[PDB]
């Protein structure tokens, strides 16, 4: 299955999304129990445009592995794309509970809180993101400025 996964990735980087999905489905068929492969297939499917099927594969992955940071990250990204911030909020709170030391999680949590509207939550999370990491602070500065 590793080399089918590699063929799928090689097709994906060249833009042939349907071919990448074709490789990735076989890669699943070999090893049904997986998480990263499921996520890659859901990404290819949403690249094609099948958002509902990507969601179904994603929830299958999360049911199979309840503790999977990347899977939940992809759930949150897709829900943000789909304007489902109501449950995206719980996805991000669970994710930041999983990873407390990652500044990227704090950035997304604060951005979602600002989008939904909690000013205090947004400013607190963005200040925490500032404190943790100054490398990506340029975006964090703008995120504070727009919230303020």
């Amino acid at each position: 299955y590793n080399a089918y996964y590699g063929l799928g990735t090689s097709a994906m980087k060249l833009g042939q999304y349907e071919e990448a999905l074709l490789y990735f489905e076989k890669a699943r068929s070999i090893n049904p129990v997986n998480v990263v492969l499921i996520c890659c297939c859901g990404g290819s499917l949403e690249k094609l445009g099948y958002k509902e099927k990507a969601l179904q594969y994603y929830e299958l992955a999360c049911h199979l592995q309840p503790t999977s940071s990347l899977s939940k990250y992809k759930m949150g990204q897709l829900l943000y794309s789909m304007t489902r911030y109501n449950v995206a909020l719980q996805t991000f709170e669970e994710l930041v509970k999983l990873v407390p030391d990652d500044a990227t999680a704090h950035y997304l949590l604060g951005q979602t809180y600002r989008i939904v509207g909690r000013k205090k939550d947004a400013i607190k999370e963005l200040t925490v993101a500032m404190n943790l990491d100054p490398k990506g602070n340029q975006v964090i500065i703008d995120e504070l400025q727009k919230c303020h």
Partner: protein
């Protein structure tokens, strides 16, 4: 009417030609490393400085390579065909492109030595890197260099002049005269000439040469 307007757009004449008062002389680039300037610092990387010992030259040779490769850039020196004017059966152009100061390439033949750089696909060169060693190779030092440009051996045309006085380091030449909008050169055919060396030399070495162009998982 669409046909008529596009034809004017492809070939503007009255709008383009301002006065047609070109000076037609070849522009000459100054390479001296005793004067400090912002423009010279852009083209001269190693920095302005007795003659350093060869090991110091080797040390600065590596630091120049590292600095040039430090920036976001893509090297395609090995993505092209090379054909010098003549060999000497001791060192082909491989040791010139080996990124090693100790080894080098030498031609042997007619005085106007030619170095051909043919490309397979349309590559957009932005920075051309060349290394000189005036104190290390004073006998075979390149004194005057003329760089051409073109899409084929047929349509080779003059691009720039380069006069050598004292340059013991890497030389960077980004191209801006040809296209101000792109700040890069677009050609498939590049050739170099070395019509005469220092102190009336005969042959010429080439220590280094490089070409620069711009652009969760299971193992």
């Amino acid at each position: 009417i669409g046909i008529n307007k596009v034809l004017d757009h492809l070939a503007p004449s009255e709008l383009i030609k301002p006065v047609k008062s070109c000076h037609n002389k070849p522009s000459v680039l100054v390479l001296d490393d005793r004067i400090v300037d912002a423009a010279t610092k852009d083209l001269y990387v190693n920095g302005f400085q007795q003659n350093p010992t060869p090991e110091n030259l080797q040390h600065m040779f590596h630091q120049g390579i590292e600095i040039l490769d430090s920036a976001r850039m893509i090297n395609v020196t090995h993505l092209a065909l090379w054909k010098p004017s003549s060999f000497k059966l001791g060192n082909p152009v491989d040791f010139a492109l080996d990124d090693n100061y100790d080894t080098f390439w030498q031609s042997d033949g007619g005085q106007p030595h030619q170095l051909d750089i043919m490309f397979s696909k349309r590559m957009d060169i932005c920075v051309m890197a060349i290394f000189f060693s005036m104190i290390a190779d004073e006998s075979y030092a390149p004194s005057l260099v003329k760089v051409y440009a073109g899409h084929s051996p047929s349509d080779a045309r003059f691009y720039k002049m380069l006069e050598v006085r004292n340059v013991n380091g890497w030389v960077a030449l980004r191209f801006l005269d040809n296209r101000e909008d792109d700040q890069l050169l677009k050609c498939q055919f590049i050739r170099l000439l070395f019509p005469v060396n220092h102190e009336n030399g005969k042959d010429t070495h080439l220590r280094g040469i490089r070409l620069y162009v711009p652009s969760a998982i299971l193992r």
